[PDB]
A paper describes a structure:
Viral protein 30 ([name]) proteins are present in all filoviruses and perform several important functions, but homologues are lacking in other negative-sense RNA viruses. EBOV [name] ([name]) is critical for viral transcription (mRNA synthesis), because it is required for initiation at EBOV NP ([name]), the first gene of the seven gene genome. [name] has also been implicated in regulation of co-transcriptional editing of viral glycoprotein mRNAs and in modulation of viral transcription reinitiation. We demonstrate that [name] binds directly to [name].
We generated protein crystals for structure determination using the purified eVP30110–272/eNP600–739 complex. Initial low-resolution diffracting crystals were optimized by in situ proteolysis and resulted in several well-diffracting crystals. In contrast to [name]/[name] contacts, which are largely similar even though the structures belong to different asymmetric units, the ternary configurations of [name] suggest that the [name]/[name] interaction may not impact [name]–[name] interactions. Residues from [name] that span 600–612 are highly conserved not only across all ebolavirus genus members but also marburgvirus as well. Although PPXP motifs typically form a left-handed turn, in the [name]/[name] complex structures, the conformation of this motif does not form the expected polyproline type II helix. Instead, these highly conserved [name] residues make extensive contacts with [name] residues in an extended conformation. Although the binding pocket is somewhat shallow, the interaction site displays a shape complementarity (Sc) score of 0.6, which is considered significant. Analysis of the interface reveals that there are seven hydrogen bonds between [name] and [name] and a number of hydrophobic contacts, which make up much of the observed total of 1,923 Å2 buried surface area. For example, [name] Q203A or R213A or Q229A did not result in loss of binding to [name] WT in the FPA, whereas [name] E197A and W230A resulted in a near complete loss of binding. However, our data show that the binding site identified in our structure, which includes residues such as W230, results in complete loss of binding and corresponding loss of activity in viral RNA synthesis.
Numbering used by the authors:
A (entry chain A): 142 to 252
B (entry chain D): 601 to 612
The structure:
């Protein structure tokens, strides 16, 4: 779980169709997103949210939930928030969020 | 004690 492995793994999966992947792999991609969110400073979370909304064509009325996910992944301890996301969100929502994030994460300034 | 995620984004 090095910086190099994280980036290579994110590059690989950013470009995959994950609509039909296995739950075990989808769960691991959620962990990947959580770890990668923690490579951004708090100061960049608003930009990460805005870039996510723009990429996904989401209205500003969806800013608050998108930002909350990034904030709470960033502050997560013991994977508690991450585990809640997995439990409480539907599969389609997890897929959409994960693909979005993996495609923006390497393109944005992290500090 | 329970952890609650926000509602998922709504795509129109």
């Amino acid at each position: 779980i090095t910086l190099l492995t994280l980036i290579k793994t994110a590059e690989h999966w950013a470009r995959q169709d994950i609509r039909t992947i296995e739950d075990s792999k989808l769960r691991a991609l959620l962990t990947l997103c959580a770890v990668m969110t923690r490579k951004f400073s708090k100061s960049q979370l608003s930009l990460l949210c805005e870039t996510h909304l723009r990429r996904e064509g989401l209205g500003q009325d969806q800013a608050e939930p998108v930002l909350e996910v990034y904030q709470r992944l960033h502050s997560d301890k013991g994977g508690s928030f991450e585990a809640a996301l997995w439990q409480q969100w539907d599969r389609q929502s997890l897929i959409m969020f994960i693909t979005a994030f993996l495609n923006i994460a390497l393109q944005l300034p992290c500090e | 004690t329970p952890t609650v995620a926000p509602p998922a984004p709504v795509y129109r």
